[PDB]
Amino acid sequence: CGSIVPRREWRALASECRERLTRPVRYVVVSHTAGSHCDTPASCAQQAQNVQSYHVRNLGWCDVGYNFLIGEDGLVYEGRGWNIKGAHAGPTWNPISIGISFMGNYMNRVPPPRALRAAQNLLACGVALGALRSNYEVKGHRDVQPTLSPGDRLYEIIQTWSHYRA
Amino acid sequence: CGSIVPRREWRALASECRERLTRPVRYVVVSHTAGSHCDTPASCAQQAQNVQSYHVRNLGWCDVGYNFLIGEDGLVYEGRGWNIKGAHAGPTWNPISIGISFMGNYMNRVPPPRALRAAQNLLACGVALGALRSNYEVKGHRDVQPTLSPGDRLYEIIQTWSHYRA
Numbered sequence: 046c047g048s049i050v051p052r053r054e055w056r057a058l059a060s061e062c063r064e065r066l067t068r069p070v071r072y073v074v075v076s077h078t079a080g081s082h083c084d085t086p087a088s089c090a091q092q093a094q095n096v097q098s099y100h101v102r103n104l105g106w107c108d109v110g111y112n113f114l115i116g117e118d119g120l121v122y123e124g125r126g127w128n129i130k131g132a133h134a135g136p137t138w139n140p141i142s143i144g145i146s147f148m149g150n151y152m153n154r155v156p157p158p159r160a161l162r163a164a165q166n167l168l169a170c171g172v173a174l175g176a177l178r179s180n181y182e183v184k185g186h187r188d189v190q191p192t193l194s195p196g197d198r199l200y201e202i203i204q205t206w207s208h209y210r211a
Numbered sequence: 212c213g214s215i216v217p218r219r220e221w222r223a224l225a226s227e228c229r230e231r232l233t234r235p236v237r238y239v240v241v242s243h244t245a246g247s248h249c250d251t252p253a254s255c256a257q258q259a260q261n262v263q264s265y266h267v268r269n270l271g272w273c274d275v276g277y278n279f280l281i282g283e284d285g286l287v288y289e290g291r292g293w294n295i296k297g298a299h300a301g302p303t304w305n306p307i308s309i310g311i312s313f314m315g316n317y318m319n320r321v322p323p324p325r326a327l328r329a330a331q332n333l334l335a336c337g338v339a340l341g342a343l344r345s346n347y348e349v350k351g352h353r354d355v356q357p358t359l360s361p362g363d364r365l366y367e368i369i370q371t372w373s374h375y376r377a
């Protein structure tokens with residue numbers, strides 16, 4: 046599970062992150078890359094690649110910041126995964142949360158349902174393995190940090206999720 | 212659970228099928244369409260429609276014959292689903308099995324690993340839901356009917372699965 050595209054499959058560089066997430070995690074933070082969007086597996090590999098390159102080469106980070114990335118292709122791409130503390134929501138939220146990030150800018154476009162489906166299924170396949178709590182709370186990026194992420198349109202949608210909390 | 216692309220999404224004609232399966236189902240039979248492959252949600256949705264069409268329109272079937280279709284786009288396309296008897300492996304096997312079909316021809320080519328991951332992830336969801344038995348048995352199309360399906364490349368692969376039984 047759960048049709049997660051593994052690091053090696055999207056041509057990732059080697060993670061160098063050591064700091065580990067205490068399971069089971071209470072919080073999920075939903076962001077956007079505010080990068081280029083992609084609707085094929087081929088373009089979404091290329092794009093996940095591009096995100097990690099910025100984070101690693103330019104920002105000198107130990108890996109891509111997000112635990113997981115959602116493509117409009119409808120597949121989840123493995124970032125730091127369930128166990129490795131992210132860099133997506135800053136110091137107060139990074140240690141106590143999983144960050145998933147929709148690849149693209151969602152101010153003036155919604156993600157297609159398969160992307161929204163992928164995410165929800167990703168979230169379920171996280172309780173199952175005990176990475177997430179049963180009663181996990183979903184926060185928007187803007188709900189924990191000064192940012193427009195995850196975009197006006199995607200933010201509206203996640204407010205309607207059963208697990209969402211302001 | 213499953214991130215399955217639902218009938219409405221690939222724009223599938225309303226099913227006319229009535230006869231049910233008895234849960235939990237013991238057998239999964241793996242086929243190929245022997246037809247044109249697709250590696251985008253866009254072309255793969257169209258392909259499900261094409262296979263549905265051939266089955267409904269040319270063979271006068273009540274619906275696409277497969278319970279589920281697997282795209283090379285890495286997405287499961289819903290057919291008859293977990294509860295409805297399909298038309299994929301003839302009259303001995305149709306009433307006691309789930310039929311999943313890889314959209315393509317896997318005599319010369321292997322399916323890309325995201326296809327193989329969706330298939331496996333699907334079955335696990337079948338078991339989760341109780342549509343499939345915990346001790347399900349995965350069979351080749353060729354293993355229960357005189358055919359080439361699911362093709363030797365794919366057949367080779369599916370023989371390496373833990374639930375596979377000659």
Ligand SMILES: [Cl-]
Nearest residue numbers: 106107108132
């Ligand atoms: Cl970092």
